[PDB]
Coordinates of C-alpha atoms in Angstrom, one line a residue:
Chain A
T1 CA 54.0 115.8 108.7
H2 CA 56.6 118.5 108.2
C3 CA 59.6 117.7 106.1
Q4 CA 63.1 119.2 105.5
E5 CA 64.4 120.4 102.2
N6 CA 67.6 122.3 101.4
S7 CA 67.8 124.8 104.3
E8 CA 64.0 124.9 104.2
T9 CA 60.9 123.3 105.8
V10 CA 58.0 121.9 103.7
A11 CA 54.7 120.3 104.5
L12 CA 53.7 116.8 103.4
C13 CA 50.3 115.1 103.1
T14 CA 50.0 111.5 102.1
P15 CA 47.2 108.9 102.3
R16 CA 46.9 106.1 104.9
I17 CA 46.6 103.2 102.5
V18 CA 45.1 100.6 104.9
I19 CA 43.2 100.5 108.1
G20 CA 46.2 99.4 110.1
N21 CA 48.0 102.7 109.4
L22 CA 45.7 104.4 111.9
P23 CA 47.7 105.0 115.1
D24 CA 47.6 102.3 117.8
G25 CA 46.7 105.1 120.1
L26 CA 43.4 105.6 118.2
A27 CA 42.9 102.2 116.6
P28 CA 44.7 99.9 119.2
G29 CA 45.7 96.4 118.6
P30 CA 43.1 94.7 120.8
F31 CA 40.4 96.5 118.7
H32 CA 41.9 95.1 115.5
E33 CA 42.0 91.6 117.1
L34 CA 38.3 91.8 118.1
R35 CA 37.5 93.0 114.6
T36 CA 39.3 89.9 113.2
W37 CA 37.1 87.8 115.5
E38 CA 34.1 89.6 114.1
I39 CA 35.3 88.6 110.6
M40 CA 35.7 85.0 111.8
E41 CA 32.2 85.0 113.1
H42 CA 31.0 86.3 109.7
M43 CA 32.8 83.6 107.8
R44 CA 31.5 80.8 110.0
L45 CA 35.0 80.2 111.2
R46 CA 34.2 81.1 114.8
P47 CA 36.2 78.1 115.9
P48 CA 39.0 78.5 113.3
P49 CA 40.4 75.3 111.8
Chain B
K1 CA 128.1 74.6 130.5
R2 CA 124.7 74.8 128.9
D3 CA 124.3 71.1 129.7
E4 CA 124.7 71.8 133.4
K5 CA 122.0 74.5 133.3
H6 CA 119.7 72.2 131.4
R7 CA 120.2 69.3 133.8
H8 CA 119.8 71.6 136.7
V9 CA 116.5 73.0 135.5
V10 CA 115.1 69.6 134.4
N11 CA 116.1 67.9 137.7
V12 CA 115.3 70.7 140.3
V13 CA 113.0 73.3 138.7
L14 CA 110.9 70.8 136.7
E15 CA 111.6 67.5 138.5
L16 CA 111.1 65.3 135.5
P17 CA 111.8 61.6 135.8
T18 CA 115.1 60.3 134.4
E19 CA 113.2 58.2 131.9
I20 CA 112.0 61.3 130.0
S21 CA 114.2 64.2 129.0
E22 CA 114.7 66.8 126.3
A23 CA 116.7 64.3 124.2
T24 CA 113.6 62.1 124.0
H25 CA 110.8 64.7 124.3
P26 CA 111.4 67.4 121.7
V27 CA 109.0 70.1 122.8
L28 CA 110.7 70.1 126.2
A29 CA 114.0 70.5 124.2
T30 CA 112.6 73.6 122.5
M31 CA 111.1 75.1 125.7
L32 CA 114.3 74.6 127.7
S33 CA 116.1 77.2 125.7
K34 CA 113.4 79.7 126.8
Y35 CA 113.4 78.5 130.4
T36 CA 117.2 78.8 130.8
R37 CA 116.8 82.5 129.9
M38 CA 114.6 83.1 132.9
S39 CA 117.3 83.1 135.6
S40 CA 114.9 84.2 138.3
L41 CA 111.7 82.4 139.5
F42 CA 113.6 79.1 140.3
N43 CA 112.3 79.1 143.9
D44 CA 108.8 78.3 142.8
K45 CA 108.5 75.0 140.8
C46 CA 104.8 74.7 140.4
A47 CA 104.6 77.5 137.9
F48 CA 107.2 75.9 135.7
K49 CA 105.6 72.4 135.9
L50 CA 102.2 73.9 135.0
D51 CA 103.8 75.8 132.1
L52 CA 105.3 72.6 130.8
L53 CA 102.0 70.9 131.2
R54 CA 100.2 73.5 129.0
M55 CA 103.1 73.4 126.5
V56 CA 102.6 69.6 126.1
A57 CA 98.9 70.3 125.7
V58 CA 99.4 72.9 123.0
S59 CA 101.9 70.6 121.3
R60 CA 99.3 67.8 120.8
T61 CA 95.9 68.3 119.2
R62 CA 93.9 67.8 116.0
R63 CA 92.4 71.3 116.2
Chain C
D1 CA 94.2 97.3 145.7
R2 CA 94.0 100.5 147.6
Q3 CA 93.8 102.6 144.4
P4 CA 91.7 102.0 141.2
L5 CA 93.5 100.1 138.4
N6 CA 94.5 101.6 135.1
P7 CA 95.8 100.4 131.6
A8 CA 99.2 99.7 133.1
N9 CA 97.9 97.5 135.9
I10 CA 95.7 95.5 133.5
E11 CA 97.7 93.0 131.5
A12 CA 96.3 90.7 128.8
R13 CA 96.5 86.9 129.1
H14 CA 98.2 85.0 126.3
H15 CA 96.4 81.6 126.6
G16 CA 98.8 79.3 124.7
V17 CA 102.3 80.6 124.9
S18 CA 104.6 80.1 127.9
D19 CA 103.5 83.1 129.9
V20 CA 105.7 82.2 132.8
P21 CA 105.7 85.6 134.6
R22 CA 102.0 85.6 135.4
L23 CA 102.3 82.1 136.6
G24 CA 105.0 83.3 138.9
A25 CA 102.5 86.0 140.0
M26 CA 99.4 83.8 140.2
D27 CA 98.2 84.8 143.6
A28 CA 99.1 88.4 142.9
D29 CA 96.9 91.3 143.8
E30 CA 98.3 94.3 141.8
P31 CA 98.0 93.0 138.2
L32 CA 94.6 92.1 136.7
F33 CA 95.3 89.5 134.0
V34 CA 92.3 89.4 131.7
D35 CA 91.2 88.0 128.4
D36 CA 91.4 90.5 125.5
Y37 CA 87.8 89.6 124.6
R38 CA 85.1 91.9 125.9
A39 CA 81.4 91.6 126.7
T40 CA 78.9 93.7 124.8
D41 CA 76.0 95.3 126.6
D42 CA 73.4 92.7 125.7
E43 CA 75.4 89.7 126.9
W44 CA 76.4 91.7 130.0
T45 CA 72.7 92.2 130.8
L46 CA 72.1 88.4 130.1
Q47 CA 74.8 87.6 132.7
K48 CA 73.2 90.0 135.1
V49 CA 69.8 88.3 134.5
Chain D
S1 CA 113.8 95.5 117.9
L2 CA 112.3 94.1 114.8
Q3 CA 113.6 90.9 113.1
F4 CA 112.3 89.3 110.0
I5 CA 113.8 87.1 107.3
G6 CA 113.4 86.1 103.7
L7 CA 114.9 89.3 102.6
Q8 CA 118.6 89.8 102.0
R9 CA 119.9 91.7 105.0
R10 CA 120.5 94.8 102.8
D11 CA 116.8 95.4 102.2
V12 CA 116.1 94.8 105.9
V13 CA 118.6 97.4 107.0
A14 CA 117.2 99.7 104.3
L15 CA 113.8 99.3 105.9
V16 CA 115.1 100.0 109.4
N17 CA 117.1 103.0 108.2
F18 CA 113.8 104.2 106.5
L19 CA 112.1 103.9 109.9
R20 CA 114.8 106.1 111.2
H21 CA 114.1 108.5 108.3
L22 CA 110.5 108.7 109.3
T23 CA 110.3 111.6 111.7
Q24 CA 112.0 114.1 109.4
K25 CA 111.0 113.1 105.8
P26 CA 107.8 114.3 104.0
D27 CA 104.7 112.3 103.2
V28 CA 104.5 110.3 106.4
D29 CA 102.1 107.5 105.2
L30 CA 103.0 103.9 104.6
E31 CA 101.0 103.6 101.4
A32 CA 102.5 106.9 100.3
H33 CA 105.9 105.2 99.8
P34 CA 104.9 102.3 97.4
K35 CA 108.5 101.1 97.1
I36 CA 108.5 99.9 100.7
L37 CA 105.4 98.0 99.9
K38 CA 107.3 96.5 97.0
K39 CA 110.3 95.4 99.1
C40 CA 108.1 93.1 101.2
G41 CA 108.8 90.3 98.8
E42 CA 105.4 89.7 97.4
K43 CA 105.3 87.6 94.2
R44 CA 109.0 86.8 95.0
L45 CA 109.1 84.9 98.3
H46 CA 107.0 82.3 100.0
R47 CA 103.4 83.5 100.6
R48 CA 103.2 82.2 104.2
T49 CA 106.4 84.0 105.3
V50 CA 106.2 87.1 103.1
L51 CA 102.7 88.0 104.5
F52 CA 104.4 87.7 108.0
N53 CA 107.2 90.0 106.8
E54 CA 104.5 92.5 105.7
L55 CA 102.7 92.2 109.0
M56 CA 105.9 93.1 110.9
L57 CA 106.6 96.0 108.5
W58 CA 103.1 97.5 109.1
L59 CA 103.4 96.9 112.9
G60 CA 106.8 98.6 113.0
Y61 CA 105.5 101.6 111.1
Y62 CA 102.4 101.8 113.3
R63 CA 104.6 101.6 116.4
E64 CA 106.8 104.4 115.2
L65 CA 104.0 106.8 114.3
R66 CA 102.3 106.0 117.6
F67 CA 105.6 106.7 119.4
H68 CA 105.7 110.1 117.9
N69 CA 102.0 111.0 118.6
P70 CA 102.1 114.8 117.8
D71 CA 102.7 116.7 121.0
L72 CA 100.5 119.8 120.5
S73 CA 100.9 121.4 123.9
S74 CA 102.0 125.0 123.1
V75 CA 99.7 125.3 120.2
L76 CA 96.9 124.2 122.6
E77 CA 98.0 127.1 124.9
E78 CA 97.8 129.4 121.8
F79 CA 94.3 128.1 121.1
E80 CA 93.1 128.8 124.6
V81 CA 94.6 132.3 124.7
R82 CA 93.1 133.2 121.3
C83 CA 89.8 131.8 122.6
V84 CA 90.0 134.0 125.7
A85 CA 90.9 137.0 123.5
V86 CA 87.9 136.4 121.3
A87 CA 85.7 136.1 124.4
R88 CA 86.9 139.4 125.7
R89 CA 86.5 141.1 122.3
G90 CA 82.9 139.8 122.0
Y91 CA 81.9 141.0 125.4
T92 CA 83.2 144.4 124.6
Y93 CA 81.8 144.5 121.0
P94 CA 78.4 146.3 120.4
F95 CA 76.3 143.5 119.0
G96 CA 72.7 143.9 117.7
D97 CA 71.2 142.1 120.6
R98 CA 73.1 140.9 123.7
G99 CA 71.4 137.5 124.0
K100 CA 72.5 135.7 120.8
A101 CA 76.1 136.9 120.8
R102 CA 76.3 136.4 124.6
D103 CA 75.2 132.8 124.3
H104 CA 77.6 131.9 121.4
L105 CA 80.4 133.8 123.3
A106 CA 79.5 131.8 126.5
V107 CA 79.7 128.5 124.8
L108 CA 83.0 129.7 123.3
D109 CA 84.2 130.9 126.7
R110 CA 84.0 127.7 128.7
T111 CA 85.5 125.5 126.0
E112 CA 88.9 124.7 127.6
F113 CA 90.6 121.4 127.3
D114 CA 90.4 118.3 129.5
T115 CA 93.7 116.3 129.5
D116 CA 92.3 113.7 127.1
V117 CA 93.6 113.5 123.5
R118 CA 90.4 112.2 121.8
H119 CA 88.0 114.8 123.2
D120 CA 90.1 117.8 122.0
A121 CA 89.3 116.9 118.4
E122 CA 85.6 117.4 119.2
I123 CA 85.9 120.5 121.3
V124 CA 88.1 122.4 119.0
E125 CA 85.5 122.1 116.2
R126 CA 82.7 122.8 118.7
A127 CA 84.5 126.1 119.7
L128 CA 85.3 127.1 116.1
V129 CA 81.7 126.7 114.9
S130 CA 80.4 129.1 117.6
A131 CA 83.3 131.5 117.0
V132 CA 82.4 131.7 113.3
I133 CA 78.8 132.3 114.2
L134 CA 79.9 135.2 116.3
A135 CA 82.2 136.7 113.7
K136 CA 79.4 136.4 111.0
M137 CA 77.0 138.2 113.4
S138 CA 79.6 140.9 114.1
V139 CA 79.8 142.1 110.4
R140 CA 76.2 141.3 109.4
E141 CA 77.0 138.5 107.0
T142 CA 74.4 135.8 107.3
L143 CA 74.3 132.5 109.3
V144 CA 72.2 129.5 108.4
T145 CA 69.3 129.1 110.7
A146 CA 68.1 125.8 109.1
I147 CA 67.6 123.0 111.6
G148 CA 70.3 120.3 111.2
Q149 CA 72.8 122.6 109.4
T150 CA 75.9 124.1 111.1
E151 CA 77.6 127.2 109.7
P152 CA 80.9 125.9 108.1
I153 CA 84.2 126.6 109.9
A154 CA 85.9 129.3 107.8
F155 CA 87.6 132.7 107.9
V156 CA 85.7 136.0 107.6
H157 CA 86.7 138.8 105.2
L158 CA 90.3 137.8 104.6
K159 CA 91.8 138.5 101.2
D160 CA 92.0 135.5 99.0
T161 CA 95.8 135.3 98.9
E162 CA 96.1 134.9 102.7
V163 CA 93.6 132.0 102.8
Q164 CA 95.1 130.4 99.7
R165 CA 98.4 130.3 101.4
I166 CA 96.6 129.0 104.5
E167 CA 95.1 126.1 102.5
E168 CA 98.5 125.3 100.8
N169 CA 100.0 125.1 104.3
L170 CA 97.1 122.8 105.4
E171 CA 97.8 120.5 102.5
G172 CA 101.5 120.4 103.5
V173 CA 100.3 119.5 107.1
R174 CA 98.3 116.7 105.6
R175 CA 101.5 115.4 104.0
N176 CA 103.5 115.5 107.3
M177 CA 102.0 116.0 110.8
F178 CA 105.1 115.8 113.1
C179 CA 106.9 118.8 111.6
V180 CA 104.5 121.4 112.8
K181 CA 105.2 124.8 111.3
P182 CA 102.6 127.6 111.9
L183 CA 103.8 131.0 110.9
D184 CA 100.9 132.5 108.9
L185 CA 100.7 136.0 110.4
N186 CA 100.1 138.2 107.3
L187 CA 97.3 140.0 109.1
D188 CA 97.5 143.7 108.4
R189 CA 95.7 144.8 111.5
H190 CA 93.6 147.5 109.8
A191 CA 91.8 144.7 107.9
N192 CA 88.5 144.8 109.6
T193 CA 87.8 145.1 113.4
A194 CA 89.8 143.5 116.2
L195 CA 87.1 140.8 116.5
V196 CA 87.7 139.8 112.9
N197 CA 91.4 139.7 113.6
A198 CA 91.1 137.5 116.7
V199 CA 88.5 135.2 115.1
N200 CA 90.7 134.7 112.0
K201 CA 93.6 133.8 114.3
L202 CA 91.4 131.5 116.3
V203 CA 90.0 129.7 113.3
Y204 CA 93.5 129.3 111.9
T205 CA 94.9 127.6 115.0
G206 CA 91.7 125.6 115.4
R207 CA 91.9 124.3 111.9
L208 CA 95.6 123.5 112.4
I209 CA 94.9 121.5 115.5
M210 CA 91.9 119.7 114.1
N211 CA 93.7 118.7 110.9
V212 CA 96.7 117.4 112.8
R213 CA 94.5 115.3 115.1
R214 CA 92.2 113.9 112.4
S215 CA 95.0 113.0 110.1
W216 CA 96.8 111.1 112.8
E217 CA 93.7 109.3 113.9
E218 CA 92.8 108.2 110.4
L219 CA 96.3 106.9 109.9
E220 CA 95.9 105.0 113.2
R221 CA 92.6 103.6 111.9
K222 CA 94.0 102.4 108.5
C223 CA 97.0 100.8 110.1
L224 CA 94.9 99.0 112.7
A225 CA 92.4 97.6 110.1
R226 CA 95.1 96.4 107.8
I227 CA 97.2 94.8 110.5
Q228 CA 94.1 92.9 111.8
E229 CA 93.5 91.7 108.2
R230 CA 97.1 90.4 108.0
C231 CA 96.8 88.7 111.4
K232 CA 93.6 86.9 110.2
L233 CA 95.4 85.8 107.0
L234 CA 98.4 84.4 108.9
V235 CA 96.1 82.4 111.2
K236 CA 94.2 81.1 108.1
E237 CA 97.3 80.1 106.2
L238 CA 98.9 78.6 109.2
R239 CA 95.9 76.5 110.2
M240 CA 96.6 74.1 107.3
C241 CA 99.4 72.2 109.1
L242 CA 98.8 71.1 112.7
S243 CA 102.0 70.9 114.7
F244 CA 103.5 72.4 117.9
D245 CA 105.3 75.1 116.0
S246 CA 102.4 76.2 113.9
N247 CA 100.1 76.0 116.9
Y248 CA 102.5 78.2 118.9
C249 CA 102.5 80.8 116.1
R250 CA 98.7 80.5 115.8
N251 CA 98.3 81.1 119.5
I252 CA 100.6 84.1 119.2
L253 CA 98.4 85.4 116.4
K254 CA 95.0 84.8 118.1
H255 CA 95.6 88.0 120.0
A256 CA 93.4 90.9 118.7
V257 CA 94.6 94.3 117.8
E258 CA 92.2 97.1 118.9
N259 CA 94.5 99.3 121.0
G260 CA 98.0 100.7 120.8
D261 CA 99.0 98.7 123.9
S262 CA 97.5 95.6 122.2
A263 CA 99.9 96.2 119.2
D264 CA 102.9 96.7 121.5
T265 CA 102.0 93.4 123.4
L266 CA 101.6 91.6 120.0
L267 CA 104.9 92.8 118.6
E268 CA 106.9 92.0 121.8
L269 CA 105.2 88.5 121.9
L270 CA 106.3 87.8 118.3
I271 CA 109.8 89.1 118.9
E272 CA 110.6 87.5 122.2
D273 CA 110.6 83.9 121.1
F274 CA 111.4 84.0 117.3
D275 CA 113.3 80.7 117.6
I276 CA 110.2 78.9 118.9
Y277 CA 107.9 79.6 115.9
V278 CA 110.2 79.8 112.9
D279 CA 110.4 76.2 111.6
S280 CA 107.2 76.3 109.6
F281 CA 108.4 79.6 108.0
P282 CA 110.7 78.6 105.2
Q283 CA 113.2 80.9 103.4
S284 CA 112.1 80.7 99.8

């Protein structure tokens, strides 16, 4: 991003800590839900309790 | 005579029965001093009767 | 009326004291007797719904 | 007319005479005369009735200051004519590039008033900021181009004694707003160009109008908030006893106070039937 300081502009770079921080225009919610179902299938919880 | 005005209002404007009056119905006694001050509006009685109704309502409650 | 109302034509209702004059008006056109309470936008939209 | 009890009549007539002293006397602010907030009877009289006495005191003071409502008409005309003079001067003045000065002068040019009290407070500031931009550009002192920052409203190239007396007068205007007294024409006209002259006069009248308006509005706000507080305390204290009289007083109080007309309606509703709702209010 770009940030404001006293009468000045500054640039800011910071890390996206977790997968979810990726924008929902590039990593949309349905993709995340299907990935969760993939995890469920991995854990033999395909029908969850 | 304030008594004449009070009897006139009670009997004509408000049309109360003789068995209940400002002597035996104190909130009416307090409201009659206000009502006598309103010389006009004696032609329409329903407004005054409804006003006394809601005064009795606000006089008695537990909330 | 024939002309939009204004703060003078609107008059608040007293709801509990002997507001005789508005009773004497009752079926009156000119004065708009209204509660002093107001509807916020959200509850206004709920009414409209 | 106000009527309240608990006090000896001498203090009541002192309070009313004080309300008659209001328009002329300095420091027009209710908390700026603590002795009147002493004479309410607090820690002397009965709580339930003394808080009512204080409510009526605050309501009367609010009603008087609202009745005076500073009538800034001719100074508004002065502001508009100074604005037009600055506009003409800027259009004649040889600026560095026509676009920037033309735009600020245009937003200055069409700034005239609108027959509403509340909006003038915004538009006077909105005109002054652009005027100061223009004046700064005229004499090549800088202006802040940072996004989200507006160049502060101030004079340009006055000598410090003039602006010091301006600020002392502004403090005096803070103390009293109805006794408007602008006379600060110490401008020796060879002090910088005609544009500086006109913009200094414009910023002076704009700061005057803005200060008067804002002080009156904040006085309104404080009075309204505290009177609504007092109304809530009366309804709370009166709830403890259920009876026709206390219920009538409560139903009087359950009116809100968010407008000046609301306060007028409230005061007249209390006064009109003071023999209906007084039994529960004891003297001492």
